[PDB]
Tab-separated table of C-alpha atoms and ligand atoms in Angstrom:
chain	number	residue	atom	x	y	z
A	1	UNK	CA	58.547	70.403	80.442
A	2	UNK	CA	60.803	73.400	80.717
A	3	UNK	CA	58.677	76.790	81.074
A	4	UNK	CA	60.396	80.649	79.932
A	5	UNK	CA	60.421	82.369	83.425
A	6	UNK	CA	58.934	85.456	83.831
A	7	UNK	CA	60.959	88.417	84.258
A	8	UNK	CA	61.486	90.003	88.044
A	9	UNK	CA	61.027	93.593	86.748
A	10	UNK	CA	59.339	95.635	83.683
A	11	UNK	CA	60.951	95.573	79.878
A	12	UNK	CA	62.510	99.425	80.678
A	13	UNK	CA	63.411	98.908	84.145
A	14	UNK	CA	67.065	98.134	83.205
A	15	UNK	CA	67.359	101.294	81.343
A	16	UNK	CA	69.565	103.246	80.577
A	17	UNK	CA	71.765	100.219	80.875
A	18	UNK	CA	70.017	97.401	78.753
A	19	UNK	CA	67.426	98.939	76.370
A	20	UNK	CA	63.543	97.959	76.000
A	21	UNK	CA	63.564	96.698	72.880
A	22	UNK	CA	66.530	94.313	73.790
A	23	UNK	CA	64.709	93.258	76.814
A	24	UNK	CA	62.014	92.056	74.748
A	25	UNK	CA	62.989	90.347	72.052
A	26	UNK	CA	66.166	88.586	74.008
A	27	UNK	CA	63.500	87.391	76.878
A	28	UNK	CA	60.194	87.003	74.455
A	29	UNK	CA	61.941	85.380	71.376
A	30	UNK	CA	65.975	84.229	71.960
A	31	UNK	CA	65.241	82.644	75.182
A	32	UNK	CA	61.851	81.399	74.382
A	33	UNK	CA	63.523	79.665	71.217
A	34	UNK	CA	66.331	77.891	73.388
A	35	UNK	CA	62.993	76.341	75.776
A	36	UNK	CA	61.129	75.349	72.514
A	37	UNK	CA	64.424	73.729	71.393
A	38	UNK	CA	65.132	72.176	74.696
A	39	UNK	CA	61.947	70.721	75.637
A	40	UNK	CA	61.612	69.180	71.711
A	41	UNK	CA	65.256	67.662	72.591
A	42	UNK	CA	64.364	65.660	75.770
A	43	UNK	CA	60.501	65.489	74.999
A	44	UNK	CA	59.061	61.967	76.511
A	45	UNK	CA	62.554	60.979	78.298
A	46	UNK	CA	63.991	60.817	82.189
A	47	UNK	CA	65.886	64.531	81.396
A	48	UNK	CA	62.566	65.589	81.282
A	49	UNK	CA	61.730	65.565	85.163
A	50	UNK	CA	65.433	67.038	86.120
A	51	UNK	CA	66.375	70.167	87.154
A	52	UNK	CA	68.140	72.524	84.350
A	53	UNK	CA	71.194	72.724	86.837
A	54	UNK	CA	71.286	69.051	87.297
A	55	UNK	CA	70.665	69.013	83.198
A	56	UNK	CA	73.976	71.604	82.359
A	57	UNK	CA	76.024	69.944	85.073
A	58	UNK	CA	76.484	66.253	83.825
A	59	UNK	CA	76.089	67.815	80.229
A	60	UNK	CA	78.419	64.807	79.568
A	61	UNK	CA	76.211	61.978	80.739
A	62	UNK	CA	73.320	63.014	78.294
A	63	UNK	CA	72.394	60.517	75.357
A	64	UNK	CA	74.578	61.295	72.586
A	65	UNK	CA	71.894	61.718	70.376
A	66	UNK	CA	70.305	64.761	71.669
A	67	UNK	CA	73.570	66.239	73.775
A	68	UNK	CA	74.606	68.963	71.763
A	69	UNK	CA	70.980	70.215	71.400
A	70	UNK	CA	70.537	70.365	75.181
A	71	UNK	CA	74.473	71.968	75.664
A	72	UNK	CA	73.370	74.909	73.001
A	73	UNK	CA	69.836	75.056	74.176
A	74	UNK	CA	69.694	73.817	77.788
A	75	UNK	CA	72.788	75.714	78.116
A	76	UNK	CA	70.796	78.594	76.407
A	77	UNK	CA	67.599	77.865	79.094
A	78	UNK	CA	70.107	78.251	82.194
A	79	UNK	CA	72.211	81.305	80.925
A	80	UNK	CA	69.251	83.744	80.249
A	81	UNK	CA	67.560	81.786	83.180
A	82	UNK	CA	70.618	82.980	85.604
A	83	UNK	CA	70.809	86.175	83.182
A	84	UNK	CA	67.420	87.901	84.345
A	85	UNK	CA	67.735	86.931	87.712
A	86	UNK	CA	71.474	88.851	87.962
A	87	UNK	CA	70.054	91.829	86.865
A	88	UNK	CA	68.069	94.565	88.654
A	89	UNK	CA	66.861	98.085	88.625
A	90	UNK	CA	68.311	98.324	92.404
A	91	UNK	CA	71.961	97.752	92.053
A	92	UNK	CA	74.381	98.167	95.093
A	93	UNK	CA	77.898	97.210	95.508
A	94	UNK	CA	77.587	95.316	98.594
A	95	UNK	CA	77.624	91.844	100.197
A	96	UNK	CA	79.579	88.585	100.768
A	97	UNK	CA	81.122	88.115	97.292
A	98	UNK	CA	81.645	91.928	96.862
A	99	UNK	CA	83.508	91.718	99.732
A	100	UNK	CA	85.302	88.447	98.897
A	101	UNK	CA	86.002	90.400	95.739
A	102	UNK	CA	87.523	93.647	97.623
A	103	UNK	CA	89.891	90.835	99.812
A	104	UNK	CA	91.318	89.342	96.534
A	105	UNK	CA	91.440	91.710	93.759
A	106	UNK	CA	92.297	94.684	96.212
A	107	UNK	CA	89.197	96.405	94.872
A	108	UNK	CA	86.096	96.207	93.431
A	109	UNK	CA	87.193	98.328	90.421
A	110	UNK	CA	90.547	95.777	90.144
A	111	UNK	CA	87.767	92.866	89.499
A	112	UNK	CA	85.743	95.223	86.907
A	113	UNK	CA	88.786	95.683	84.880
A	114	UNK	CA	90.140	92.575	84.785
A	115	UNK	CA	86.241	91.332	84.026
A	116	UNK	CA	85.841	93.842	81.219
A	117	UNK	CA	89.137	92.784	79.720
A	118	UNK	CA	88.100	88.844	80.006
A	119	UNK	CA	84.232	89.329	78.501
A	120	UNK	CA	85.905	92.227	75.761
A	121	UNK	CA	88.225	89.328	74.486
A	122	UNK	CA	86.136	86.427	74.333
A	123	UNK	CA	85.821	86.221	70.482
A	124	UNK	CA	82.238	85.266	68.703
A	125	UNK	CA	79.522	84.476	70.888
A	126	UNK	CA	79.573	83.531	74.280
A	127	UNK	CA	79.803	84.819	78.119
A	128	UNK	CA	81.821	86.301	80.679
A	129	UNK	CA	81.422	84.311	84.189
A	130	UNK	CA	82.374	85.374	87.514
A	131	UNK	CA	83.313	81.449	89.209
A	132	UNK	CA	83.604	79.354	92.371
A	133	UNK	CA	86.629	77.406	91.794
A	134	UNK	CA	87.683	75.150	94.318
A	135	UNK	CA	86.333	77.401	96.845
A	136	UNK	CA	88.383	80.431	95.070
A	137	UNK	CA	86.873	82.978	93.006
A	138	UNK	CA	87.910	83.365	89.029
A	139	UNK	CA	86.901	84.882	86.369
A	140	UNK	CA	86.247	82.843	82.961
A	141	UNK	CA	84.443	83.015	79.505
A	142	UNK	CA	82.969	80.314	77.486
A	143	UNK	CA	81.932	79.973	74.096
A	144	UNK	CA	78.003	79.817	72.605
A	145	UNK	CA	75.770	78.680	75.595
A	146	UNK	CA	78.265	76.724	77.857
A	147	UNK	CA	78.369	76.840	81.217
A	148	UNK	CA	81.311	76.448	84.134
A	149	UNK	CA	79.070	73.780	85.804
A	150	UNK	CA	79.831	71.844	83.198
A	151	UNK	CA	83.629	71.616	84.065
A	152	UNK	CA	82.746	71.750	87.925
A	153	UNK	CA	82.860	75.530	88.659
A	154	UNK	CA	79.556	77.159	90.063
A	155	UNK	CA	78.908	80.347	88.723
A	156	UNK	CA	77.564	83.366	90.486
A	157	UNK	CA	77.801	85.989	87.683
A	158	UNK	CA	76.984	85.961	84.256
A	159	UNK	CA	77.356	88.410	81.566
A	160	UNK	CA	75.924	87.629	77.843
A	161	UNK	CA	78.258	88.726	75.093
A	162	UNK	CA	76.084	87.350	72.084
A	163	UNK	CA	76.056	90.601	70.061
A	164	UNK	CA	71.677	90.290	70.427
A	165	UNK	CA	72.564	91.349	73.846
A	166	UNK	CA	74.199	94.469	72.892
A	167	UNK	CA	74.485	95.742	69.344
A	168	UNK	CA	70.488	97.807	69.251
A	169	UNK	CA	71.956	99.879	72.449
A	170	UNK	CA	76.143	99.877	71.804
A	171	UNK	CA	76.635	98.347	68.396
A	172	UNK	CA	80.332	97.180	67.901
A	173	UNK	CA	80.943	98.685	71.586
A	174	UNK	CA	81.061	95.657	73.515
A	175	UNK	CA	83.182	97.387	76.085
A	176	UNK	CA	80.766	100.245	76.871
A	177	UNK	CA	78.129	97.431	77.400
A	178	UNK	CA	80.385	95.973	79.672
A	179	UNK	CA	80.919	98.777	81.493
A	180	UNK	CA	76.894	99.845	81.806
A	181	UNK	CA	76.043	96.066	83.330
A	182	UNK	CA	77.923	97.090	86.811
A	183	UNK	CA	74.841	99.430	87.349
A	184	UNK	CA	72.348	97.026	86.975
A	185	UNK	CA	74.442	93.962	88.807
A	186	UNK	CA	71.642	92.007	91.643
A	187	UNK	CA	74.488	91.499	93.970
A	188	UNK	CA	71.885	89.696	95.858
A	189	UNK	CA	71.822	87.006	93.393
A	190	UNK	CA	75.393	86.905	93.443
A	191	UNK	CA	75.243	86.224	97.303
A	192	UNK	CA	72.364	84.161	96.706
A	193	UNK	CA	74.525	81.608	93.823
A	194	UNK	CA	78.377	81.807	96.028
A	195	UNK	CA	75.977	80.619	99.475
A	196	UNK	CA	74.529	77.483	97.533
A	197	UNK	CA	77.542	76.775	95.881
A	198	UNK	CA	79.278	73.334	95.741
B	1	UNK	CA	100.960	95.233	55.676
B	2	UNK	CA	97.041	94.875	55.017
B	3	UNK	CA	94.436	97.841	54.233
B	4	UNK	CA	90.933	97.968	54.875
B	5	UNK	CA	89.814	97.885	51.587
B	6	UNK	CA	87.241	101.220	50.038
B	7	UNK	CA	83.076	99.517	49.852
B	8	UNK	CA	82.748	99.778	45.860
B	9	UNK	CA	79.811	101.782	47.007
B	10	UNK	CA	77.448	104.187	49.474
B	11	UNK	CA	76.743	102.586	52.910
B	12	UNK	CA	73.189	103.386	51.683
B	13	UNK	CA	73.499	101.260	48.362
B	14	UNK	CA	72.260	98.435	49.589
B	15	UNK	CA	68.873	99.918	50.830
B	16	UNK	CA	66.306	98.577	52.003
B	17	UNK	CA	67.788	95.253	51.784
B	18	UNK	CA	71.103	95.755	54.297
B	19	UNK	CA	70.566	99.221	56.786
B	20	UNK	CA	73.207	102.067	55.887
B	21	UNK	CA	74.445	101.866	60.267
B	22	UNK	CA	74.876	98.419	59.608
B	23	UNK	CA	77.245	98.827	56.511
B	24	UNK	CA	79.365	101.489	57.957
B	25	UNK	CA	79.375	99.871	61.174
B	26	UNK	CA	80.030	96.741	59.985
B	27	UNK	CA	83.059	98.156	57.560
B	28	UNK	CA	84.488	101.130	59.565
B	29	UNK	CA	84.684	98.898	62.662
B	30	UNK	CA	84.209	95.424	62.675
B	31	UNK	CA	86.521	94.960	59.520
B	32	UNK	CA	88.801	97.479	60.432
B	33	UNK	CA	89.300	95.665	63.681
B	34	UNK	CA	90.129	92.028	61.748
B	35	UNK	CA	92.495	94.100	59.480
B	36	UNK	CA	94.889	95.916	63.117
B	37	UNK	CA	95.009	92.502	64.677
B	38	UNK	CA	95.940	90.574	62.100
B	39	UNK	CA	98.523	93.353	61.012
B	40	UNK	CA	99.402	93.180	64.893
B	41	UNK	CA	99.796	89.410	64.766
B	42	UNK	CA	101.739	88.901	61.645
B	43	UNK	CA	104.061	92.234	61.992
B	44	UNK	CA	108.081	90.985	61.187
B	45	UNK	CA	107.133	87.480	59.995
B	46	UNK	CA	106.759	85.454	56.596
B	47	UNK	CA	103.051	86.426	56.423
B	48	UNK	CA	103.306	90.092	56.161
B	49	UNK	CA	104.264	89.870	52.411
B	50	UNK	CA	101.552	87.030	51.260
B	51	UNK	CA	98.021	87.151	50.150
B	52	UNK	CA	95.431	86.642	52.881
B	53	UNK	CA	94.068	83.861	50.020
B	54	UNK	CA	97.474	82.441	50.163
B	55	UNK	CA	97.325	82.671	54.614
B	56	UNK	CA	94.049	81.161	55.147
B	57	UNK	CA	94.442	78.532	51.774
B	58	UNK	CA	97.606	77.584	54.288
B	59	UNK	CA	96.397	78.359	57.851
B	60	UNK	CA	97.451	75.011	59.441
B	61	UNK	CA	101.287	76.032	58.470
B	62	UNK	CA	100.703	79.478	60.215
B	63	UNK	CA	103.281	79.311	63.368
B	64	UNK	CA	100.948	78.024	66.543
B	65	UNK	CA	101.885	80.499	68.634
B	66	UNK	CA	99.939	82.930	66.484
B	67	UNK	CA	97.215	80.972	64.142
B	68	UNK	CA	94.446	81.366	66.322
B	69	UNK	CA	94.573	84.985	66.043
B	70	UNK	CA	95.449	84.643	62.445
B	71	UNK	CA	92.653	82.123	61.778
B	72	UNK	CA	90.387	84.958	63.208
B	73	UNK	CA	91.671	87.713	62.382
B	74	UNK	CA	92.880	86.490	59.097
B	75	UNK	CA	89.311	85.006	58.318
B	76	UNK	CA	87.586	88.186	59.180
B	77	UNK	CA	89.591	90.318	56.545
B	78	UNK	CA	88.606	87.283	53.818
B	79	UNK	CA	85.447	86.600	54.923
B	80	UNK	CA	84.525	90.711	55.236
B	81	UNK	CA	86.676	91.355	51.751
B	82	UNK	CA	84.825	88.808	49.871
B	83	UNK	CA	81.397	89.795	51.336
B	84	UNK	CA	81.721	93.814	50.582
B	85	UNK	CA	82.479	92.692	46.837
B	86	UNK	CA	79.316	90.368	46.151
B	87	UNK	CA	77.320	92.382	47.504
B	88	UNK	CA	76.044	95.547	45.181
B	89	UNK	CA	73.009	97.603	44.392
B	90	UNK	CA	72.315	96.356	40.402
B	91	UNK	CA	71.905	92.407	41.869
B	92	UNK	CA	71.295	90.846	38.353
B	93	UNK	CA	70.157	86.891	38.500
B	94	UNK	CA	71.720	85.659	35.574
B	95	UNK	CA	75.325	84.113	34.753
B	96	UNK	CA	77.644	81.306	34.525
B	97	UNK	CA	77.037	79.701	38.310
B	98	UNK	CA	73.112	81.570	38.191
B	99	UNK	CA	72.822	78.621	34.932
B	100	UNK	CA	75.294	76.053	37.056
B	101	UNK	CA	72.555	76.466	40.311
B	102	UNK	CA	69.423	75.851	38.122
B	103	UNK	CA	71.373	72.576	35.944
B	104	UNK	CA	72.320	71.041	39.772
B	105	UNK	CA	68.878	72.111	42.122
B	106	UNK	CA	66.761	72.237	39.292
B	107	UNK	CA	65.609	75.886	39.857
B	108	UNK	CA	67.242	78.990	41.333
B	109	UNK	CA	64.827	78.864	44.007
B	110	UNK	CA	65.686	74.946	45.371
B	111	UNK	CA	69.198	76.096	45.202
B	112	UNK	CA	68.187	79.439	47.631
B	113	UNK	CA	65.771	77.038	50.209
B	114	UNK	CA	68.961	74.610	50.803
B	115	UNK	CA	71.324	78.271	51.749
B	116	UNK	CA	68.499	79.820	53.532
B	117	UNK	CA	68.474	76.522	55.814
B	118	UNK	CA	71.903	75.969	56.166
B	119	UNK	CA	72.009	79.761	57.053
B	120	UNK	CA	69.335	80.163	59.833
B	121	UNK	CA	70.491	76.549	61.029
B	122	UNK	CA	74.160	77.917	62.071
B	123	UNK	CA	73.919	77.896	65.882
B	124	UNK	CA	75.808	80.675	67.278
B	125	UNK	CA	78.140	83.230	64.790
B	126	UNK	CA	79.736	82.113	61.392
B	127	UNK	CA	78.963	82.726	57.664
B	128	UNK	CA	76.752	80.252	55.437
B	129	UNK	CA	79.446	79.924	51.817
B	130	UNK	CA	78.403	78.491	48.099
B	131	UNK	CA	81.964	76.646	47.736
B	132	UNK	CA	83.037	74.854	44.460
B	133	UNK	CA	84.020	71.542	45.685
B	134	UNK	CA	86.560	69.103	43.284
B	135	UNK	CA	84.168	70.942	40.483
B	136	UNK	CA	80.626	70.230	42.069
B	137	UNK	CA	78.725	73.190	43.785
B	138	UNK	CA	78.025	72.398	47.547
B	139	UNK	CA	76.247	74.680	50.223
B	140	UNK	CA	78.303	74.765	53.746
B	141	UNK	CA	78.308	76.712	57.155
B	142	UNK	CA	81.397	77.837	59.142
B	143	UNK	CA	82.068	78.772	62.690
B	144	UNK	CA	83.571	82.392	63.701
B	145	UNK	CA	85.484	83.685	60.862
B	146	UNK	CA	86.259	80.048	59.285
B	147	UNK	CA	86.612	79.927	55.332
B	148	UNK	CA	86.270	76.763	53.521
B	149	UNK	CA	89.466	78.076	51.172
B	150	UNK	CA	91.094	76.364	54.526
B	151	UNK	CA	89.513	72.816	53.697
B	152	UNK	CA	90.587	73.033	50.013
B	153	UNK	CA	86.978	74.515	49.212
B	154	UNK	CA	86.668	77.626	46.777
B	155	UNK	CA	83.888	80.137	48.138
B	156	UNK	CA	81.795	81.938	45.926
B	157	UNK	CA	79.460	83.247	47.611
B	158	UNK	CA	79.124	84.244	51.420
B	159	UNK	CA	76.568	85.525	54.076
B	160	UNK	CA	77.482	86.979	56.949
B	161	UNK	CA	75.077	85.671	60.062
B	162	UNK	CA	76.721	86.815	62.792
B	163	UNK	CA	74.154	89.081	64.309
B	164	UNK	CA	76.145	92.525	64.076
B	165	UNK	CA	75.446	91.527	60.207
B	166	UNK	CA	71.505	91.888	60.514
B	167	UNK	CA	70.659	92.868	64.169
B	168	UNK	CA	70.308	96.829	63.251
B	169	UNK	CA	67.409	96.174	61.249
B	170	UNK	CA	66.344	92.698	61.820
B	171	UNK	CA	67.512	91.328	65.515
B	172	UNK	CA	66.213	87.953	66.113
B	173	UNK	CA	64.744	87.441	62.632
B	174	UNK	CA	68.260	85.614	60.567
B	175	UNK	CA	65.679	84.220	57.747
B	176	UNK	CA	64.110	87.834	56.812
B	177	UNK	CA	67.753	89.082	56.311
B	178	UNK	CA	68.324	85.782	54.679
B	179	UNK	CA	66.060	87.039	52.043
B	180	UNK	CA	66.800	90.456	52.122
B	181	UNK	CA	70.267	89.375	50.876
B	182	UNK	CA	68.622	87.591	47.334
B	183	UNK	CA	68.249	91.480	46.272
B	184	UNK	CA	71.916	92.519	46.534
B	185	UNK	CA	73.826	89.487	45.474
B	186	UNK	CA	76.931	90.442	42.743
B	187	UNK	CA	76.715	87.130	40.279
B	188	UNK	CA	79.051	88.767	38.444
B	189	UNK	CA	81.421	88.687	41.625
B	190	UNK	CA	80.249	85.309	42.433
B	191	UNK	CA	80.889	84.071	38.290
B	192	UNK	CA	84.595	85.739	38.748
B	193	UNK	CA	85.691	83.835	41.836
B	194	UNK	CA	83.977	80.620	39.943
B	195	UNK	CA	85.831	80.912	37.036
B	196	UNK	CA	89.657	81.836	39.046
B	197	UNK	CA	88.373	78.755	41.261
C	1	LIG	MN1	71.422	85.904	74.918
C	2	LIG	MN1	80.753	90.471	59.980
């Protein structure tokens, strides 16, 4: 059975960035709700005893029954899983993929705008992925609690753009969210996701 | 072509039941921001000069290259335009669908349990409608800014559940803003659209 992971850090550590109270009730009751969910879904069956990775990636191969609970919630159980994990209090701009990034956006500030633009204009609920395509980076969004594993892309940075992510800190200001997640970006985990990839 | 149309009252009105943030917020911005993009997406074409009924009624004849944005966009100034109007602070539990509810659930109550489900059961963002369907009463949920006028399916009544409609004041907890929403419903509103339906 699937199990909510702790987080690496304290409730305010990620502030001012990502608020307490957000911290909280995203970790304690939205992700908590997607492993209930999940582990009633594939309760007593072989998905059971795999991997949530292995789970999200060969969404497609899970019994029709119970695969749209386990793309919304598994998807859900990976996301916030990746989500924590991504984020620190220590922050800094530095590494393989930032430097990958530098080589083919020009900049790091090139890849934050064109970022910001993709995650402003996904529309509804959903997130904002940084990818390994084909061995090339890209930057996409998907809707709800999907994942680019899914569609074989590996992805090595996530940003959550439900609005219970954002609206207690930056209300209808998805943008200024967007812009306060660089500071709290575990670059390490980035390095960490683009080495084990494919 | 489209305004953002006035609240018919206070961004407070609705206290305790909806937060006073929320209703500006969710008015001065959110709505505003359905009503410049579909103006944006619609600017020099047949759709300027019809209803937004008549647009999303007819969405699968709106051009391809723009009905996704329209369906949105379009949707949100419906969806947010209907929702501002049956919503006010003298909610009054009475009326022509109020008697309608009670003939088909069998109590006011049954009727609220079903749209309370439906509502908290809508995975994701979307809006939870009371639709008169070929003259029966049906509960239904929609994606995004979906309307069932689309399907051939009068609304009558809408909820909001996307969380910028309850996260000020409620975050993670849809079903106590579910409730919440019992206290501010316009029958009246909800007995109008009926009746044009
Ligand atoms: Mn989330
Ligand atoms: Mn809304």
């Amino acid at each position: 059975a699937f199990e909510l992971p702790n987080l690496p850090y304290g409730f305010r550590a990620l502030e001012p960035h990502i608020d307490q109270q957000t911290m909280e009730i995203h970790h304690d009751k939205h992700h908590n709700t997607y492993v209930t969910k999940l582990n009633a879904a594939v309760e007593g069956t072989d998905l059971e005893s795999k991997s949530i990775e292995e789970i999200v990636a060969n969404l497609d191969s899970v019994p029709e029954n119970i695969q749209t609970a386990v793309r919304n919630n598994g998807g859900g159980h990976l996301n916030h899983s990746l989500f924590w994990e991504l984020l620190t209090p220590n922050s800094e701009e530095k590494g393989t993929v930032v430097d990958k990034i530098k080589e083919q956006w020009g900049s790091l500030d090139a890849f934050k705008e064109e970022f910001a633009n993709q995650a402003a204009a996904r529309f509804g609920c959903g997130w904002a992925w940084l990818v390994v395509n084909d061995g090339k980076l890209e930057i996409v969004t998907t809707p709800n609690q999907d994942n680019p594993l899914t569609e074989g892309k590996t992805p090595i940075l996530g940003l959550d753009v439900w609005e219970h992510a954002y609206y207690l800190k930056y209300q209808n200001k998805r943008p200024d969210y967007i812009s306060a997640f660089w500071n709290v970006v575990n670059w390490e985990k980035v390095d960490e996701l683009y080495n084990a990839a494919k």
